[PDB]
Design a protein around this ligand. Structure first.
Ligand code: MCM
Ligand code: K
Ligand code: K
Ligand code: ZN
Length: 357
């Protein structure tokens, strides 16, 4: 087995011209890459080149209007960049933003290709800006184009349309964009774990609740696991994987796993408020490696404590490389509301999955 890694410092050029301290910082990716060097993980990986996604590739998931509007920002004056950015929910834009989003996407396409052609078994993508909040027709939540969603469709474009792709989204935020793009689609199983707080947590929509199970032929293929009323950590995420994520995923039998890997559920994250440990992420990564004959691609999404995300994503890469997984405490009692959450999701999805019955 070989593990691929893609990283390009050019993606640091996307920046906030009006608030240089905005948490979606350029140094998120450079700090993660540096940690891979410090831990001697980088040389253990096969380096995969970044590339620009093409406009035709963006059209796999996004409208021509949305593509054209974001493209138009590459040469805008500051005043217009500011005005355009303010038209979205939680977006900043610089002249380099469009190109960086193209690079984030193209890097993941190259990574998916390396996996599917057999050049590597699995891979990690240290990319920014993030993607999972980006919708077909709009930008949102620091995201312009939906990198993971696009990567699923790209993967299908070089194998077959119905290639089974599992997207596991453990960013602490709901991937509203990914849900919507695949809501009526039974070829892409979307499973998100996220803080919800009955709608008080970003992005503040009931679309993130457990009863949104998908639409039409996609009924059953959208699994929301929403957290309420508690500081969740390793026990809760481990239980969700044991009762929900893994039984459903095994029954789906994916041919490729994409992880929307935000590390903002990590201990120390200022936006997330949760306490998943780097061993917790390691455990989750090792679990997903049991699927799809190990074909797993880990795509950076959110995560804003620089030391936390650096250590957390490095531990995931360590697992992909075959290092020994952590033994954690599966007997620690869950926060009471987490049990309620897991039970609500189980009730919602039992009609669609025999493994839950
Ligand atoms: N959405 C959002 C934007 C900016 C933030 C800062 C600067 C700090 C923080 O703790 O949370 C934020 C959340
Ligand atoms: K999520
Ligand atoms: K789906
Ligand atoms: Zn997030």
């Amino acid at each position: 087995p070989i593990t691929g890694l893609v990283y390009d410092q050019r993606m640091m050029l996307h920046h906030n011209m009006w608030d240089s301290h905005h948490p979606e910082l350029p140094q998120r990716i450079s700090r993660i890459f540096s940690r891979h060097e410090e831990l001697r993980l980088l040389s253990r990986c096969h380096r995969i080149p970044a590339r620009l996604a093409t406009e035709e590739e963006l059209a796999l998931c996004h409208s021509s209007k949305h593509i054209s509007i974001i493209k138009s920002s590459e040469h805008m004056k500051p005043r217009d960049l500011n005005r355009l950015g303010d038209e979205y929910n939680s977006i900043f834009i610089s002249n380099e933003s469009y190109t960086c989003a193209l690079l984030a996407a193209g890097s993941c396409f190259n990574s998916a290709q390396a996996i599917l052609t057999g050049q590597v078994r699995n891979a990690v993508a240290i990319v920014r800006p993030p993607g999972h909040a980006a919708e077909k027709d709009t930008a949102c939540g620091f995201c312009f184009f939906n990198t993971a969603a696009l990567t699923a469709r790209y993967a299908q474009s070089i194998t077959r349309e119905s290639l089974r792709v599992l997207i596991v989204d453990w960013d602490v935020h709901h991937g509203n964009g990914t849900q919507h793009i695949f809501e009526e689609d039974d070829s892409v199983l979307y499973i998100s774990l996220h803080r919800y707080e009955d709608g008080a947590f970003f992005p503040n929509s009931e679309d993130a609740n457990y009863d949104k199970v998908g639409l039409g032929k996609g009924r059953g293929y959208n699994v929301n696991i929403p957290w309420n009323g508690g500081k969740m950590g390793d026990p809760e995420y481990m239980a969700a994987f044991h009762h929900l994520v893994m039984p459903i995923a095994r029954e789906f039998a994916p041919e490729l796993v994409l992880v929307s890997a935000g590390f903002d559920a990590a201990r120390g994250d200022p936006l997330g408020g949760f306490q998943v440990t780097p061993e917790g992420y390691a455990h989750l990564t090792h679990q997903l490696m049991s699927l799809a004959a190990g074909r797993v691609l880990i795509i950076l999404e959110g995560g804003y404590n620089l030391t936390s995300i650096s250590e957390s994503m490095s531990m995931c890469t360590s697992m992909l490389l075959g290092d020994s997984p952590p033994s954690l405490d599966h007997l620690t009692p869950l926060k009471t509301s987490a049990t309620v959450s897991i039970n609500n999701v189980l009730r919602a999805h039992a009609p669609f999955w025999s493994s839950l019955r």
